[PDB]
Amino acid sequence: QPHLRKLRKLKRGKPSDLEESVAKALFELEASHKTLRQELPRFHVNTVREVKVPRSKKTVLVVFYPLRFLMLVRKVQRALTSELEKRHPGCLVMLVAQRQITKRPTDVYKLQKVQRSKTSTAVFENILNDMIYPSDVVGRRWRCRTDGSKLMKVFLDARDRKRIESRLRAVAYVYKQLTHRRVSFGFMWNPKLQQVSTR
Amino acid sequence: TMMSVLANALRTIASAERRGKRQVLIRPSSKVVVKFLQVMQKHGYIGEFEIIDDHRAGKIVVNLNGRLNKCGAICPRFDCATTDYEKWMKNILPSRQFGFVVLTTSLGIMDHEEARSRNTGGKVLGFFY
Amino acid sequence: IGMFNEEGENVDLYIPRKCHATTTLIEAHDHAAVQISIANVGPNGVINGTTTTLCIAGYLRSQGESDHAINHITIDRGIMRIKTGKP
Amino acid sequence: VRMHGNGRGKASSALPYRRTPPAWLKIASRNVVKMVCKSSRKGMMPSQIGMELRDSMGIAQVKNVTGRKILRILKHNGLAPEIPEDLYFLVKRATQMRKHLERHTTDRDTKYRLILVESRIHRLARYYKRVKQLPPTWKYES
Amino acid sequence: DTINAKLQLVMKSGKYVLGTQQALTTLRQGRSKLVVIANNCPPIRRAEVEYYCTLSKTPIHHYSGNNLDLGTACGKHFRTCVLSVTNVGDSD
Amino acid sequence: GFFDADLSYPTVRTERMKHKRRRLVQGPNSYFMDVSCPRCRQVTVVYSHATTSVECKGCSKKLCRPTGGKALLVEGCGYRRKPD
RNA sequence: UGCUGUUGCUGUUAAAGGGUUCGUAGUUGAACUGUGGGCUGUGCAGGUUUGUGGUCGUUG
RNA sequence: UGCGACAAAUGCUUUCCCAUCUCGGUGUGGUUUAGU
Ligand SMILES: [Mg+2]
Ligand SMILES: [Mg+2]
Ligand SMILES: [Mg+2]
Ligand SMILES: [Mg+2]
Ligand SMILES: [Mg+2]
Ligand SMILES: [Mg+2]
C-alpha cells in the first residue's frame, strides 16, 4: 500500500495497527496539508509506541523517526503533531528521534574518542527537547534532598504555559519510560532574572 | 588562578558556617564537590542543596544547619592505605568519636569509616566535623 | 541527648541550651545570651498561661543581628506575619 | 588585561542560556554560510565577520544557527587565515611598535610594551606549534 | 592601514605582479586594476607609471612607506617599487 | 521586610540590579530591534549595541552611530524591540 | 627543639619579600562523556482523594 | 557489469546554477488549517 512508504522498509511487511494508522495519516497529510506537503515525501517513521499515562486521560503516541530527519521534523513539528493528534482522538503525539547511546567506556583513551552527541547526557537532553520542541528549556536545577535523592527540575518560559501545561505530565512520564530518568517541570516568567512563576 | 575547586568550595562552606549563615553559594561546581556534599549530607552535617545549571561549571546553593563546625580539603591528595586510617584520624580529626575523613577510593568517594568497612584505600580528599 | 555511658548513664554534667538562630551551644560564661518568653494568646485577646521561649546566643547580640534573628524565628513559629493581608 | 599587566578588567560578553535562534530569524543555515564565506572573501577576520552579522543581519551567534563556528566554516571552505587571527594581530602590534621605535629610540615606554608583546608571542606561538596550527620550526623574528 | 589590509587580501586571493617592468606590461594590456607606488620610487619612474595609469584610466595609490615597506606589506622578503593587482580577488 | 532572601530564588528587585555576569545565571544585556529607515521605511534588524557602521541597504543611510555602550539611532527613525 | 618546621616555624615594627618586569628548566594547573530500571517484603518523608476551635462570604 | 534484502549521526522526492510564466483534537482558551 502506498501509505506504507511512510514506514521503514523493515516494518512495511507486517505493520502494527498504530504504525499503519500513523502511516496512513502521514500519507494523507503529504498531499492535503499545504505546509506538510513540502516536507513529508522525504520523511518516514521507524515505529509507533503507545504509552499509558497513569491517573490521566488519553494515551501518548510516541513516534520514532530516523535522526537524519531531525531538521525536517523540526521545521513542521508543531503542525505535524497537531494534525496527528486530531487524526487520533484521545491521544497525544510526540515525535522523538531515535538516537544511539554509546555506553561510557572504562578506558581514558576510549573516552577521548566518544562522539559527544552519542553520550547519554546529550541524548537524554535531546529527547527532552524533542518532546517539548516549540518551547525551549530556560533553566535546569537539581534538588538534592537530604535523603540522597537528586531530582531534576526543568524550567520552561511562562509564555508557553497555556500551550504545554496540559501535556507536561505526559511528557514527564514518557521521559521516564524512555530514559529511565525522572524530570519535574516549572515555569519562569523572567528566565533572564531566574524568576519562577507561582501559577 | 584557582587550582583546586574542591578546596575553594570547602573553604566557602567553612566561612559561611563560622559566620552562621543559613545558605551559601558555591562557584564553580564539580562532580567531586557534589560527591563531597552528598557525603556530608548523608551524615547530616548539611541540609538540602541545589545545583544550578548555567551551561558552564555550575553553581551550588547549600542550605546549612548549624551542625558543621569545620570542613576543609587536604592538598595534595595523599595516598592512604587501610592501615593509615588511624593516623589520619589522629592528625586531623578532633576526636575518635565524631568527624569524618573523606577518601577517593576506586569504589567511589566515601567517608573513612565506610572505606574501612569496605577494606579499601585511596586518596584523602578532605574532612568535616 | 548528651554523652552516654556504655551501660546507659548520662555522664554529662548538664545539657547546654542551643541558640534558636545559629544552633550554637550557649556557654555558662557569655553573659550576653538572653532568654525571651513570648506570651501565648488565646482566641480572645487575653494571654494564656503558656508562653513561647527562644534562646539567643551572646555573640549574635554583639553583631547586632539578634533583631533579624528574632524576626526570622518568630515568623517560623507562626507568631509573626510576614506581610499584611490583601486589601 | 591580566597577562602582562596589573589590569583586572571584567568586561566581556555573556552568552545566553537559551541557544535556540529566535523565531523571527528566517535566514537559512546555508545562506548564513554563504554570508560568512563571502565576508571572509571580502577580507574580514572571523571576529569582524561575526560583528557584521550580529549588527546588521540579526544573527547573534553563527554557531547557534549553522551549528558551526565562523573559523570552522572558513576552514571547511579553506578560507581560514594562514596565521591564526590573534597571532596575526599581535605580530602586527609588534611590527607597528618596532617601526615606531626606529624613529623614537628614547621611547622607553614603547620599548617596555614591546618586550611584553614579544614575550606574549613566544607563548602563543609555542601553543600553536604544540597544537599544530603552526608549522614546527616556526619562529617569531624581530 | 586600509591599504595594508587590501594588499594582504589581494596576496591571499587575488592576482598581482611585482616590479616596475611587469606593472608597465600589465598597464599596456587592459589587465591592471590598481597600481601601488612606494614613496621611495625614483621620480622619473613614478612619473612614467603615473602617465601610463592616466592613459589607461587605472587607479593609482601612493603608498606611505618605501619599497622595503611595500615588499613587507606584500609578505615578501624583497623590495618592490611598483605593485600591480590584476585580479582584486574579491578585495575591492 | 521580614522576607529573608533565598540565594536559589532571588527577588526580582535585587536580581535586576545585578551585573550581567554576577546574576545567578549570566546572560546578555543586549537585544535586536527592527528599524525603519527614515527614507524608504525598509525594515532593518539592528543590534542594540552595534559598533560597526550599520547601513540600510538601498538608501545606504547610516541607521545608527556607535557609542561607548548602546548604539544611537538616527533621528526620526522607527524602531521596535524584537522578542527573545 | 614547632630553634630546620613534610606532618610543623617565621618574614609591617623583633632576623628575614628580591627595586621592577620578563623568563626557561621546575612546580602547579577550570568544568564536562556518569543518578541504572522496574517487583516484592520492611521502616521513613510530602504531590490529593472520601470523610471530619478557627479565618471567610453570609454552608460558606 | 548488473541483482535482491537491510541500515545510515543529519532531508538529495534536495541545494545551487539558466530559462517560461468554520473543522477536528485538547484544556476549562490556546492549537495546524480554512473562510474573512
Ligand atoms: Mg605571569
Ligand atoms: Mg623561630
Ligand atoms: Mg627587620
Ligand atoms: Mg617589595
Ligand atoms: Mg603536567
Ligand atoms: Mg581537573
Tab-separated table of C-alpha atoms (C1' of nucleotides) in Angstrom, chain D residues 3-7 90 93-94 97-98 100-101 107-120, chain G residues 21:
chain	number	residue	atom	x	y	z
D	3	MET	CA	48.641	38.627	31.419
D	4	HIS	CA	51.458	41.211	31.289
D	5	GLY	CA	49.895	43.932	33.385
D	6	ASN	CA	48.084	44.825	36.573
D	7	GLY	CA	44.681	45.224	34.916
D	90	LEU	CA	49.866	40.639	17.989
D	93	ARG	CA	51.165	45.101	17.014
D	94	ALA	CA	54.850	44.264	17.474
D	97	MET	CA	55.777	49.319	17.669
D	98	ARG	CA	59.123	48.398	16.109
D	100	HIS	CA	57.743	53.492	15.851
D	101	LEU	CA	60.832	52.620	17.906
D	107	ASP	CA	60.561	55.999	23.737
D	108	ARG	CA	61.398	53.606	26.549
D	109	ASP	CA	57.738	53.006	27.410
D	110	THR	CA	57.060	51.581	23.948
D	111	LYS	CA	60.225	49.502	24.321
D	112	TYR	CA	58.787	48.090	27.549
D	113	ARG	CA	55.473	47.336	25.836
D	114	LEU	CA	57.407	45.699	23.000
D	115	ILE	CA	59.063	43.187	25.343
D	116	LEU	CA	55.652	42.171	26.686
D	117	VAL	CA	54.142	41.807	23.207
D	118	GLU	CA	57.020	39.596	22.048
D	119	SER	CA	57.187	37.578	25.262
D	120	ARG	CA	53.458	37.042	24.709
G	21	U	C1'	59.324	43.389	35.000
